[PDB]
Design a protein around this nucleic acid. Structure first.
Lengths: 512, 189, 103, 49, 124, 99, 78, 49
RNA sequence: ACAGAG
DNA sequence: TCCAGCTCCACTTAA
DNA sequence: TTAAGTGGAGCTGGATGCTCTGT
């Protein structure tokens, strides 16, 4: 995981600083360590370790468990720091599904890690004073009305809470309080009759104290898993075929776990009432879709039942394999041409095939197909089987059967994506740092405008801003900004490939 | 205007100077090595101030000379930021005014920090200062160096090390200022 | 010239058509047959781009961005109070934090 | 070790390499330091509270 | 070689005047040798540095002149850099004390400034 | 014949000789008789100081062919050896400095 | 106090005569009155017999501590 | 070099090294095998090794 | 690679 | 030419 | 009935004195 530790070295530096990433990378790289050796193995002062640990235990990035002799060891979560890259995709998917108040609720949770409900309804209502005008303040009711609708849909979950020391072990204080999750009240919100108004930044006791709320990242990944399956059906068959897929997965939100190969089977009698009524479809045409989607050999859905009319299940693990295949075959075409992707689809279907059968079955001749075979074994998309005649395993007396393995090529393709994002961040931070003379010069001409904007700001200060020698230099600052906007956007779009890859790698692991 | 700089060093004393007290032979050897030289981060060393601790005088195998580790303090010309000095002019150039400070010579008064009523010359090297009532545009900065009084605003360390294998830039640079009222020649104020 | 190995076990049964001798090494950046697919645009893809650059400027200003402390300042002066970087300090919930982490 | 002192060309530790020699020069460790005049501690109480 | 402390103590230019003069008393009894230019770089930086000091008002001073110049200036609430520059250049008017004292018209009253002119020139 | 046994732990040296041996009881038990053909080839680099300058001037004046003699001469801070068979050795004996 | 042996060993004797001969080979001052000797090792042994060599033998114990013995206070022998 | 035809020079072998250790001779074992065979110096970067 | 010598 | 490690294979106990 | 830990048997990789003197 050298690409993961390199990429986590950048995300901790941009979002938290330099004397925290040395603590943060060292916990990922080596393992769970007590507190005295982290100051030793890195070399910072013991106070700066306590600052760097309290900022990493805040954002749910490192954990702690008590071990033998009462020592506390800190263990980082490498998968969690990589999910700091998907923050702009999280704030937008709570803008489509929820109001702009709910867009700011997730934003204060992702930027502070753990907050109380009383603190977030104040801070969101304060920040929504900028979004409004003309006497209308934001009040604590309609913020909390959006908040409790999130906890009904599990996008905000309660943190693991402190234990009750009056019930469990009264007496000597432990070095670490040994927190524990409670399944019942993760979403059982505390009641708040206290209301108020958001202050407009004029610049001139708590009932849920201890009840901290955090963003539930597993809920979004259940939601993003839906749109990968729903928009796949929308391209293949029909939009009416896609809404039926959209209907079943929305019903399967609260009733199945996030790791289940087959969801709860829903009968076709109750899908009909569950669909929105704008679709002029009968019960019989609804049974026509469910028997032609069952006719798909891709098996997005299945029958799996006979009682209650038409019983049908929609598949979860098999739907990811059809997407991760399409994820893995989309890059074979764009890197090596369309005629090379013909082979990668051929050797995938006929599971073990040789050279002579490929050139026959794919109508690509010798010396042009064999170049497209040999550039994929070196890129680890495709392997040999090497069935021998003798135990000598000599090359002149054996058969080399080509084979495409989905799992080994998907882990390989994910490992390229982590380094691909780290290279984009390194190119942006290179061009940002080398124009630190341009940006500060453009900042000083704007600071004359920014400072003294209204109080005593005469009109004879607008002509000395373009008058400085930055006037032909604006060509490069516009060449700067067209570079930063492309590299930031390409940093986001690679995360679409990661989620289709990482979900397939996660779902195929039994984790026994 | 100086600072003491506390340093450690290992000094070789060759064996023909064993007739002489070791406290005198170390002080002669450290002045032969540190005088008139700009150490990188601390500045220009003038002379040895004192020796503060003198450890054991080992004799290593393969040599008869006595090696001893020396703790000492050295006086260093290193003016702090925003300090007022007095010195003479070396001459004039379109790049600025070259101010001489006795032993030291690289002091640049930049044209962006000159006194504002004259900022550019009439294609001539010697810089002027135009006062309206008397001496318009001819109050000159003479190359013979009458005494001025300037204010240091910037100092810079360039690492004069070899870049590349083997087989003259100024390492200790200093940027003064004159634009404050009261600075300048000793005649003007 | 003859080698230690047999060429006939490598190949070259005719005895001719040996590969040519590379005179100059290949370039650092060999040119590509295919190009990057252009980016996806739209009103959803661009708002996430706008939200991303706002998070850099935000999280660099928050007190969780623990800067490194300054040192080796040369002298004291009265302008230190004018150059005092003021910023509010966040304090955690020590009930959730272990006891070994108090300042 | 002995065998890799012979390879690396440094003198070995056994034999005559076990001890170190000092030269008995006329030396005065800790000589009387020069007193400072300006920056003594009794005249420079700091400015800030 | 290695440096243990970058800025140990501030030095008045009288302390260098006493240092280079007492260095000269044991110097020039043994000339340079042309075994190396170490005796060359020593002699140029020692002679010329004392000549720059020999035009400054740091001459004719004593230790106890400096010991009382810091004594009278103890009750004026000035920094070490503001107490040092009053000894090296001997300010005689109130225009350069606005340079040697930062925000001089805001920390010190006009009488407090003018008493500082009498403090320097009557001791030095 | 590798590096470790053949060239590192044991290696060929110079200032060394090898001859047939033969007895002599008129010597002591701590003496050895070196032939003059080997005593002219083998040299010991004697530094010039205050105690041996009059001896080494005569050993330079004998030269490389008469037996109490010298084959090379090296200046004080130079690394180049003047081969003493040529030149006037009465001049190079007068210029013997210390070191 | 000092607990190690008071007799100079053969290794101390050999290296003291070696380092003293290398010092006398360079132009170091001689503590005894030489009488026509040219080999520096012979002058070193005359200085050893007369107890005048300015070398302090520092003996390192295997833990890290040491003892500073003078040459003029070890018992010399054959 | 090797032999009498090539003006060779003699060999402190493996066994004669073992005798010089037994005497405790450290500087003689340094002079024979470093100073008078193949003495040399190298430039070493102390950072990257 | 072979022969010698101690 | 002689000798320690490494790996393969039957052979009891234990459930 | 069989899972498993440990014996005995075969395979493999290592080693075997110091120099000069010549063709």
């Amino acid at each position: 995981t050298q690409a993961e530790i390199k990429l986590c070295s950048l995300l901790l530096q941009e979002h938290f600083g330099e004397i925290v990433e040395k603590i943060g990378v060292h916990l990922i790289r080596t393992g769970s360590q007590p507190l005295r050796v982290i100051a030793h193995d890195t070399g910072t002062s013991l106070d700066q370790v306590k600052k760097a640990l309290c900022v990493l235990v805040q954002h749910n990035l490192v954990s702690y468990q008590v071990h033998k002799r009462g020592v506390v060891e800190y263990e980082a979560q490498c998968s969690r720091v990589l999910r700091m890259l998907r923050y702009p995709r999280y704030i937008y998917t709570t803008k489509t599904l929820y109001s702009d108040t709910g867009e700011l609720i997730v934003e204060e949770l992702l930027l502070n890690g753990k907050l109380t409900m009383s603190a977030v309804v104040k801070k969101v209502a304060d920040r929504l004073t900028e979004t409004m005008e003309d006497g209308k303040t934001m009040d604590y009711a309609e913020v909390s009305n959006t908040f409790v609708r999130l906890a009904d849909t599990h996008f905000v979950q309660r943190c693991p809470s402190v234990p009750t020391t009056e019930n469990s072990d009264p007496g000597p204080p432990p070095p670490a309080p040994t927190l524990v999750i409670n399944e019942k009240d993760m979403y059982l919100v505390p009641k708040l009759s206290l209301i108020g108004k958001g202050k407009r930044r004029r610049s001139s006791p708590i009932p849920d104290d201890g009840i901290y709320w955090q963003a539930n990242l597993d809920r979004f990944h259940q939601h993003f898993r839906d749109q990968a399956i729903v928009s796949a059906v929308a391209n293949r068959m029909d939009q009416t075929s896609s809404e039926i897929v959209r209907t079943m997965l929305r019903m399967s939100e609260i009733t199945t776990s996030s790791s289940a190969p087959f969801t709860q089977p829903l009968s076709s009698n109750e899908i009909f009432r569950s669909l929105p009524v704008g679709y002029n479809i009968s019960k019989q045409v609804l049974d026509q879709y469910l028997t032609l989607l069952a006719d798909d050999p891709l098996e997005f859905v299945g029958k799996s039942g006979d009682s209650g009319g038409g019983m049908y299940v929609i598949n979860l693990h098999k739907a990811l394999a059809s997407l991760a295949t399409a994820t893995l075959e989309s890059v074979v075409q764009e890197r090596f041409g369309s005629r090379c992707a013909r082979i990668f689809r051929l050797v995938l279907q006929k599971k073990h095939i040789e050279q002579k059968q490929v050139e026959d079955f794919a109508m690509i001749p010798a010396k042009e197909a064999k170049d497209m075979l040999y550039k994929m074994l070196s890129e680890n998309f495709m392997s040999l089987q090497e069935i021998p005649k003798t135990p000598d395993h000599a090359p002149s007396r054996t058969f080399y059967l080509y084979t495409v393995n989905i799992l080994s090529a998907a882990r390989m393709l994910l490992h390229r994506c982590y380094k691909s994002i780290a290279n984009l961040i390194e190119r942006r931070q290179f061009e940002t740092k080398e124009n630190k003379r341009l940006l500060e010069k453009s900042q000083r001409v704007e600071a004359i405008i920014a400072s003294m904007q209204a109080t005593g700001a005469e009109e004879a200060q607008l002509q000395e801003i373009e008058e400085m020698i930055t006037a032909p230099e604006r060509q490069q600052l516009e060449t700067l900004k067209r570079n930063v906007n492309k590299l930031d956007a390409s940093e986001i779009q690679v995360d679409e490939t990661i989620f289709l890859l990482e979900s397939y790698i996660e779902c195929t692991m039994k984790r026994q | 205007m100086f600072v003491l700089v506390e340093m450690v060093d290992t000094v070789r004393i060759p064996p023909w100077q064993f007739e002489r007290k070791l406290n005198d032979s170390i002080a002669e050897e450290l002045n032969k090595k540190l005088a008139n030289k700009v150490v990188y981060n601390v500045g220009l060393c003038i002379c040895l101030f004192d020796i503060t601790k003198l450890e054991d005088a080992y004799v290593f195998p393969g040599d008869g000379a006595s090696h001893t580790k020396v703790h000492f303090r050295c006086v260093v010309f290193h003016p702090f930021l925003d300090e007022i000095l007095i010195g003479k002019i070396k001459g004039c150039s379109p790049e600025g005014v070259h101010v001489s400070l006795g032993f030291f010579d690289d002091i640049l008064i930049p044209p962006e920090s000159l006194q504002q009523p004259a900022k550019f010359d009439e294609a001539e090297q010697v810089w002027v200062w135009e006062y309206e009532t008397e001496e318009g545009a001819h109050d000159l900065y003479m190359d013979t160096g009458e005494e001025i009084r300037f204010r240091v605003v910037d100092e810079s360390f360039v690492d004069t090390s070899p870049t590349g294998p083997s087989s003259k830039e100024a390492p200790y640079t200093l940027v003064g200022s004159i634009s404050e009222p009261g600075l300048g020649l000793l005649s003007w104020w | 010239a003859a080698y230690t190995f047999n060429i006939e076990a490598v190949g070259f049964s005719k005895g001719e058509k040996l590969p040519d001798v590379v005179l100059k090494p290949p370039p650092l950046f060999p040119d590509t047959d295919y190009k990057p697919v252009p980016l996806k645009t739209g009103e959803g893809e661009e708002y996430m781009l706008a939200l991303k650059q706002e998070l850099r400027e935000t999280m660099k200003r928050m007190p969780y961005f623990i800067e490194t402390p300054e040192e080796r300042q040369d002298i004291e002066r009265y302008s230190k109070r004018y150059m005092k970087v003021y910023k509010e300090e966040w304090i955690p919930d020590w009930r959730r934090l272990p006891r070994e982490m108090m300042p | 070790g002995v065998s890799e002192c012979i390879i690396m060309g440094i003198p070995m530790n056994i034999g005559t390499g076990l001890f170190k020699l000092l030269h008995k020069a006329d030396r005065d460790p800790n000589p009387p330091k020069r007193p400072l005049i300006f920056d003594t501690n009794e005249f420079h109480i700091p400015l800030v509270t | 070689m290695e440096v243990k402390d970058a800025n140990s103590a501030l030095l008045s230019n009288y302390e260098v005047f006493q240092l280079l003069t007492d260095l000269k008393e044991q110097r020039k009894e043994s000339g340079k040798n042309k075994h190396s230019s170490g005796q060359q770089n020593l002699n140029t930086i020692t002679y010329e540095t004392l000549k720059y000091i020999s035009k400054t008002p740091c001459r004719h001073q004593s230790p106890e002149i400096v010991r009382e110049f810091l004594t009278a200036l103890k009750s004026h609430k000035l920094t070490k850099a503001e107490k040092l520059q009053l000894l090296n250049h001997r300010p005689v008017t109130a225009v350069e004390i606005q340079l040697m004292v930062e925000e001089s018209e805001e920390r010190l009253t006009e009488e407090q400034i003018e008493a500082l002119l009498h403090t320097v020139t009557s001791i030095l | 014949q590798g590096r470790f046994r053949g060239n590192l732990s044991g290696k060929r040296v110079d200032f060394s000789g090898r001859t047939v041996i033969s007895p002599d009881p008129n010597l002591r038990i701590d003496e050895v008789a070196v032939p003059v053909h080997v005593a002219k080839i083998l040299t010991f680099p004697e530094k010039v100081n205050k105690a041996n300058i009059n001896f080494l001037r005569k050993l330079v004046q004998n030269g490389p062919e008469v037996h109490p003699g010298a084959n090379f001469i090296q200046q004080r801070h130079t690394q180049m050896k003047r081969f003493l068979k040529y030149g006037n050795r009465e001049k190079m004996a007068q210029e013997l400095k210390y070191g | 106090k000092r607990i190690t042996t008071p007799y100079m060993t053969k290794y101390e004797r050999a290296r003291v005569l070696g380092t003293r001969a290398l010092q006398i080979a360079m132009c170091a001052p001689v503590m005894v009155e030489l009488e026509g000797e040219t080999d520096p090792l012979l002058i070193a042994m005359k200085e050893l017999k007369a107890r005048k060599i300015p070398i302090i033998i520092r003996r390192y114990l295997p833990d890290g501590s040491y003892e500073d013995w003078g040459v003029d206070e070890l018992i010399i022998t054959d | 070099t090797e032999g009498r035809s090539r003006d060779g020079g003699l060999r402190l072998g493996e066994m004669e090294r073992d005798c010089l250790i037994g005497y405790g001779a450290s500087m003689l074992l340094l002079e024979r095998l470093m100073i008078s065979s193949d003495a040399f110096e190298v430039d070493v970067c102390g950072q990257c090794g």
